[PDB]
Design a protein around this ligand. Structure first.
Ligand SMILES: Cc1ncc(COP(=O)(O)O)c([C@H]2N[C@@H](C(=O)O)CS2)c1O
Ligand SMILES: Cc1ncc(COP(=O)(O)O)c([C@H]2N[C@@H](C(=O)O)CS2)c1O
Ligand SMILES: [Cl-]
Ligand SMILES: [Cl-]
Lengths: 355, 355
C-alpha cells in the first residue's frame, strides 16, 4: 500500500534526523541530568545545545527562559493558572482577554477561571476570519491581568497580528501571551518583535516527538509554578528531565526554522496547488482569509456533504485529513508531502465528492 | 572503560525491550490517536494494551482510571491542587495530612497551598525512620480534605504501612493519596489493598523513559483537571498523547512486576551483600530500619567524611551513587547490577574511604 498524510496540524512525522539524535539517550546516556556524577554530567552538553537551538528558534535572549514542559497544553494551563494567582488574586486584576478561536487548552482553562470568578472576554471572530489589534485595545479594561492570542489558528491556518497586539500590550502595561503552536516552523517566530511575555509550543507539530513542549518566559516576568517541587528548570517547572525529547525538540526546532524558506515556497505552493485545484469543483469554497495564513493549511467546505463523510471516504483511499468548524475539511501539508501526492489527492477528493 | 550504575533511585536504564517496543511509534506509526482516520486508529490497539499492562500492574479495576501524565511530579501537583478546589475551597475541608519524608513534588506544592491559607500537617519522622498509622489517625481533624503518604521513601528505601493508613482513611471518610514512585517494580503494588483514592508513579524509576507517569484515580472519585482542555484521557488530562512512551511505560510496568520475585531475591541479596560488606568498615552505619525497605536501596553514612566527597571519588572510579539526608550515601541497585559489580564497589568504596 501507499498512503498520503495530510493531517499535519493534528500531529507530524518525527523527522528521521530527530529520531536519530534522540536514540543515544534511549540507549546508553540514560542518566538523570540532575545527578552530579558521570551519568548526569554526560547529558549536559547535548541538553544545552538542544536548549540553544530552542532560544535561537524563537529569538529568545539569554536573559529570558525557555522552559521545557510536557506539551503546549501544559504551557497553556501554566500561563493562565499562573497569572491567576500572580495577577488575578494577588493584584486584584481580575480580567483576561482572549479569543474564541483559541485552542481548548486556552479556552477550557479560562472557562474554569471564570468559574473561580474571573472575567474573561472571548474576542469575537470577524468575517476576515481574524481579530484586529483594536478589539484587544478595547476590551483591555484595567482589571486586565493578561492578553492571550494564538499566533496562528490550528483549524484555518490564519495568522493573527501579533506584533501589533504586542505593542498595544506594552503601551497598556498588560501581560501578553501567544500560543504559537501552529507558527513554529510554519512562519518566522520572533518573541522580541512580538513583545510577548509568554509563548507556548508543542514539539510534535514540527517534526518533534509528541509529549514535549516549551514555554518562553521574558527577562523578569514571574509566573507561579504549575509543577511545584522546584527542582528543575531554575525552580519554575519541576520533574525529572525528558532528556531524549529535549534533545529531539531541539533538533526538531532547528530543522523547522531551517526549512522556513522551503515551507513558504514549496509547501505553500503545494497547498496552493491543492487548494486552487479543489475549489474548481462545484460549491466548494475555502474558509477564512487566504492571504494571512501559514503556508501548509487549507480549510475547505463541500456544501451539501458534511466533512465527517469526506474524511471517512478519503481514509478508505489512504488519505488522512481532519475536521474544521465553519464542519469543513482540514488539509494540512508538511515538508514531506510531494506534488505526486497532491495531484493524487485532487483526483481522489473530486471522485469522492461526486459519489 | 567499564562503569557501574548504582543510582537507580535517581533514574534507571530503559530496558532494551522497552526501547524496542516504542521504536515503531518514533518511526511510522506517528499518528495522533485522536484523529479518526487510519493513522490515529492504527495506534489504538498498542495504546490499549499498554494501558492494560498499567491497570494490571497496580491492580486497578476496569471502573477506575489510570491517567497518563508527564511524570510523577505532574501526578503529585494534580492530586494536591485538585483536592484543593474540590475539597479545600468548595467543601471547606481546609486540612491536609502529609509527611516530612515526601518528595518535594508533594511538599513544595503543599508549601504553596499553605500560602493560599491551607493547613498542612507534615507528620514527623520517628527513630525507626517510619510513620505509624496512628499519627495519621491523630492529625486527621475534620477539616481533613486529604491524606498523602509515599509508599516508599526515595532516600532510605523505607516502606510505609500503606494498607493501614488506607483503612484509617476509609473509616474516617477522608481522601487517601499514595505517591508510589519508589514502589513500582520494587515491591507489589495493590491499590485495592491500599484503599487509595489516588496513586502516583513515574516510568523512569522502573526502566521506562523519563517524562511519563501515571495517576490512578478510583471508581467515582473526582479531581479537577490540572491540564484543562478536556480532550484526552476522558476529559481529566488534556494534551496530545505521548504514544511512544505510553507504549513503553506499559511494557516497562509489565516487566517491572514480572521481575518482582527477581528484585526481592537477587537484587535484594546484592544490596544485602553490598550493605553487609560495607558496614564492616569503621563507623559506617545504615540510616533507617532495614526490615521494611524495598529490595534495592541502601543508605549508608561514613562518619567523618561527608557524602558529597565519597560520590566525587567514587565517580572518578566509574561508580555512580547519590546523596541522602541523615549527608549519607544512596546506593540503589536494579535488575541490571551483577555480583561482579557489587564486589568491585565494596573494594573501591573501602579504598576510597581510607584515603
Ligand atoms: C517519591 C517520588 N515522587 C516523585 C518523584 C518525581 O518523579 P519525576 O516527576 O519524574 O521527577 C520522585 C523522583 N525522586 C527523584 C530522586 O530520588 O532523586 C528522582 S525520581 C520520587 O522519588
Ligand atoms: C494552538 C494549539 N495549542 C495547543 C495545542 C495542544 O498541543 P498538545 O498539548 O501537545 O496537544 C494544539 C494542538 N492542536 C491540535 C489539533 O489541531 O488537532 C493538535 S496540536 C494547538 O493547535
Ligand atoms: Cl498553579
Ligand atoms: Cl488546577
Amino acid at each position: 500500500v501507499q498512503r498520503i498524510y495530510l493531517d499535519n496540524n493534528a500531529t507530524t512525522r518525527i523527522d528521521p534526523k530527530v529520531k536519530e539524535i534522540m536514540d543515544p539517550f534511549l540507549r546508553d546516556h540514560y542518566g538523570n541530568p540532575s545527578s552530579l556524577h558521570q551519568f548526569g554530567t554526560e547529558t549536559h552538553p547535548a541538553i544545552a545545545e538542544a536548549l540553544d537551538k530552542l532560544y535561537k528558534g524563537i529569538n529568545a535572549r539569554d536573559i529570558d527562559d525557555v522552559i521545557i514542559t510536557s506539551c503546549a497544553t501544559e504551557s497553556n494551563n501554566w500561563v493562565l493558572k499562573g497569572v491567576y494567582f500572580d495577577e488575578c488574586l494577588k493584584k486584584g486584576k481580575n480580567h483576561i482577554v482572549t479569543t474564541v478561536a483559541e485552542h481548548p487548552a486556552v479556552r477550557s482553562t479560562c472557562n474554569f477561571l471564570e468559574s473561580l470568578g474571573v472575567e474573561v472576554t472571548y474576542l469575537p471572530i470577524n468575517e476576515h476570519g481574524s481579530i484586529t489589534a483594536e478589539q484587544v485595545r478595547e476590551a483591555i479594561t484595567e482589571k486586565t491581568a493578561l492578553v492571550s492570542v494564538m499566533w496562528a489558528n490550528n483549524e484555518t491556518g490564519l495568522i493573527f497580528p501579533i506584533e501589533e497586539i504586542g505593542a498595544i500590550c506594552k503601551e497598556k502595561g498588560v501581560l501578553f501571551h501567544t500560543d504559537a503552536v501552529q507558527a513554529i516552523g510554519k512562519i518566522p517566530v520572533d518573541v522580541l518583535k512580538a513583545n510577548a511575555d509568554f509563548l507556548s509550543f508543542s514539539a510534535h507539530k514540527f517534526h518533534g516527538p509528541k509529549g514535549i513542549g516549551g514555554l518562553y518566559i521574558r527577562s523578569g516576568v514571574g509566573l507561579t509554578p504549575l509543577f511545584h517541587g522546584g527542582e528543575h528548570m531554575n525552580g519554575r517547572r519541576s520533574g525529572t528531565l525528558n532528556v531524549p525529547y529535549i534533545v529531539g525538540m531541539g533538533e526538531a526546532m532547528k530543522l523547522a526554522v531551517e526549512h522556513l524558506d522551503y515551507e513558504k515556497e514549496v509547501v505553500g505552493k503545494l497547498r496552493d496547488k491543492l487548494e486552487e485545484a479543489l475549489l474548481k469543483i462545484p460549491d466548494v469554497m475555502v474558509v477564512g482569509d487566504r492571504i494571512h495564513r501559514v503556508p501548509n493549511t487549507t480549510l475547505v467546505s463541500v456544501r451539501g456533504i458534511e466533512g465527517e463523510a469526506m474524511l471517512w471516504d478519503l481514509n478508505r483511499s489512504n488519505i488522512a485529513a481532519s475536521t474544521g468548524s465553519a464542519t469543513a475539511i482540514r488539509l494540512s501539508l508538511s515538508r514531506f508531502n510531494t506534488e505526486a501526492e497532491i495531484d493524487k489527492t485532487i483526483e481522489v477528493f473530486s471522485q469522492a465528492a461526486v459519489r
